[PDB]
Design a protein around this ligand. Structure first.
Ligand SMILES: Nc1ncnc2c1ncn2[C@@H]1O[C@H](COP(=O)(O)OP(=O)(O)NP(=O)(O)O)[C@@H](O)[C@H]1O
Ligand SMILES: Nc1ncnc2c1ncn2[C@@H]1O[C@H](COP(=O)(O)OP(=O)(O)NP(=O)(O)O)[C@@H](O)[C@H]1O
Ligand SMILES: Nc1ncnc2c1ncn2[C@@H]1O[C@H](COP(=O)(O)OP(=O)(O)NP(=O)(O)O)[C@@H](O)[C@H]1O
Ligand SMILES: [Ca+2]
Ligand SMILES: [Ca+2]
Ligand SMILES: [Ca+2]
Lengths: 311, 311, 311
DNA sequence: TTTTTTTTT
DNA sequence: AAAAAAAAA
């Protein structure tokens, strides 16, 4: 992806390109994927130059109708990240794919942050061993990152211990406003270095307590829908796979599984791949594909041990 | 439909016909179906020639009162596209008809993009096997097109794999402004080649996040009403059937089904055929006719398997 | 942690800093960890100064992306409090850690307030003998504190009897509203003196009787989720370890351990370390790790005698 | 015109 | 084996 230093080849002053770096449009695709309405709200941008900054941006990126046999060629280089086990790769037909949003949920001991700890090491492998190249990013909301679990998986694949821990960016969000502000700093780091998985663990922990009651429900869902839109804008800009962790609630009053995830119909439509984790005989757990555009509905089996997620 | 090259037979200069191709009036019916007020806003068109360009256009197309026994004859050649199953053709009395707008909605795993993947292959069949002739068009908003599902339905009907994928145009919209701009390029492609289904998956995903709050509600609905007007103008120009995908919201505060679609009273009046999809025992799902000018209210049953939508 | 007396170095009037001490933001980290939405609800705070009070607070605390090899360095100084026995330290790999929430539950004679009486004396030891330095805090809901059990454990470690009892703050909650109000006075005492364990015995005794029935379930869980959020805000501000005591209920209607704790899915996701206590041959009891981000699932053995919890 | 939450015994 | 309530933009 090209930076916005290519935009002095219209004739824009250099000061206006400094303004766009304040607004988070660090990449030239972020200008072309943005509407005209949102570009006006930057202080110092008029109607005339915002007409010029959008049409000149549509020079450099291809936006228009193409053939589906050319888009089928472009899906052939999609990287799929392995999860550590052969049984989960039998479900996802190669693992978690890049350029998309994947959501995992379940109650309370089903290993949601254990997969996210295993995936931060398999995303640094060479592509011949599974997974892609690059570093990783971890956005944490409840305060469970523990780095002693990352070193145990590098013990399994034989990687260096210090090279694994130094190539992981960590940031902790303390409220819903700080959670959105960490995405603007995330887009400013991806243009220097090649990345992989952006992990938002868990995304919906802070939305349950900052907005409470029926009276503050509509203000909650508009903030969550804007947050899931920026995660979608990050996945197509840099080719980053996104992993989202959710929670569940019970249904006291239904009639005849009773645990459905939170977020309503906004997070249900925004996420495209959804996995449902539940516990069996706890040595092992059970993964089940809940919603996917391509994969059929099936199940698999887990293993959580000292070397990450296994068979 | 006749192109606008027939309009030098008034005495217009050739330069003014070049101007109308900038404004999207590629077909001679698009001039006659347009008001005088909208033709003035093209740079270089005066009051005198716009009076001449409209009345000369009303020479070539029939606009006026006719007998209903002649319009009943003209409904006899309406093509109806099959959906793949015999159970849904029992509802729609032959399938999805051409020259109209059809809307499907439901929550989150009810197979809305699975019907739209099945319909992009049955619209290329010969007319003796069901469906019509021509290519297909897919406008995508959330990024789920996957072409590996298109090849699995060509495995069912025995068509060639490469001939199916090469005859589908694909374009991805990134905001609401780009979604309207893809319709002007759509009207410039239909005059060379015979087409079929224009699929706008989903139409109302981007309108939830670009315009938020009660203060920006009135600016949202005026853009959506102009977008549904251009889809209606495409259906009568070329005889193209339009399939629209919608989403749902919940009603926290009503009293006694609770999921009603989004778009308000604008998309409810503009769309004329509406199908409500819900899930039963998930192997199968349930379709229900919600609103139609001719079809009675009834239900049917689904099947989603490896070969598309089945029985 | 810095007090909010450092906030006259923006240019705020001294009266607005007096207002924040009414709202419980006694520490400068409590301003930076708070959202903008919650700061507006203080009487006398406008939109302009609340924008200034948050960005100036983000000067003094580090909030942003860092390297995981630097966060791994910061976990090396985490204090772990001993529980009195060597067998429980073999489970927790050093004992109860600081900066987190630990939950213990079991039925009715499993020694839940006997561990909490033992931990109020081992948290005053020098760090060479196990545990950390500082005083202790006990929030009681059912009225069982008895101080004659605290003197018996100081008999074991050889500490002074009067110095142990004088360094423990005690407060009894009488309803759920008074239980939340004791946390605002708790944050105003930690900035003068160095502390340790905040013990909320038991947290969920009063929530069973003040809110009863299915009709008052949703109002119960929103109050409990706000209470567990303030306990999490206390643990990262001052580095205080939090110990929570829970109760159990039976499941009349399940099919094949039958005793699951109360609080639903809110207290299950908020607490990160959970211990399950049950009784064997009562001289001894059995501890079992139920849910932890790092520790594996195993068991241990207890001893309750005259000198606290032993081997 | 928009926006679902919440397990007891 | 059988249970119910909740609101603001
Ligand atoms: N080193 C380890 N060896 C084996 N099992 C472990 C180890 N560390 C953790 N576990 C188990 O892994 C699970 C932890 O799952 P985890 O995702 O961290 O919690 P969770 O599902 O997120 N619930 P919560 O974080 O409270 O919302 C528990 O079953 C632990 O017993
Ligand atoms: N190859 C397949 N075989 C069987 N079932 C499949 C297959 N591919 C997808 N499915 C199922 O079909 C459904 C997909 O529905 P789909 O319409 O694509 O999502 P959706 O209803 O649009 N929700 P969303 O796209 O997020 O708004 C899911 O139930 C999948 O499990
Ligand atoms: N043959 C039929 N038998 C029974 N019900 C029918 C039949 N044809 C249509 N309907 C029902 O009649 C209703 C449609 O009535 P209609 O007058 O078209 O409402 P409408 O307001 O005009 N729709 P719209 O034009 O978008 O505003 C729907 O509920 C259909 O299910
Ligand atoms: Ca977790
Ligand atoms: Ca869809
Ligand atoms: Ca009508």
């Amino acid at each position: 992806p090209q930076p916005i230093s290519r935009l002095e080849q219209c004739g824009i002053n250099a000061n206006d390109v400094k303004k766009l770096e304040e607004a988070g449009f660090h990449t030239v695709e972020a200008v072309a994927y943005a509407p005209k309405k949102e570009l006006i709200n930057i202080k110092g941008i008029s109607e005339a130059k915002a007409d010029k900054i959008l049409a000149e941006a549509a020079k450099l990126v291809p936006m228009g109708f193409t053939t589906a046999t050319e888009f089928h060629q472009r899906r052939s280089e999609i990287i799929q990240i392995t999860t550590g086990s052969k049984e989960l790769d039998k479900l996802l037909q190669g693992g978690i794919e890049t350029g998309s949003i994947t959501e995992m949920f379940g109650e309370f001991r089903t290993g949601k942050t254990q997969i996210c700890h295993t995936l931060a090491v398999t995303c640094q492998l060479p592509i011949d061993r599974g997974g892609g190249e690059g570093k990783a990013m971890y956005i944490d909301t409840e305060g469970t990152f523990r780095p002693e679990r990352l070193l145990a998986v590098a013990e399994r694949y034989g990687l260096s211990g210090s090279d694994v821990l130094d190539n992981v960016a960590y940031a902790r969000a303390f409220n819903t406003d700080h959670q959105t502000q960490l995405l603007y700093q995330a887009s400013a780091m991806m243009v220097e270095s090649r990345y992989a998985l952006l992990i938002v663990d868990s995304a919906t922990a802070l939305y349950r307590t900052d907005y409470s009651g029926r009276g503050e429900l509509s203000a909650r869902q508009m903030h969550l829908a804007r947050f899931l839109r920026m995660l979608l804008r990050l996945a197509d800009e840099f080719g980053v796979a996104v992993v989202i962790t959710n929670q569940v609630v019970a249904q006291p009053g239904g009639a005849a599984d009773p645990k459905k995830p939170i977020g309503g119909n906004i997070i249900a439509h925004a996420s495209t791949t959804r996995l449902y984790l539940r516990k069996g005989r706890g040595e092992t757990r059970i993964c089940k594909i809940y919603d996917s555009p391509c994969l059929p509905e099936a199940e698999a089996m887990f293993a959580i041990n000292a070397d990450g997620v296994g068979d």
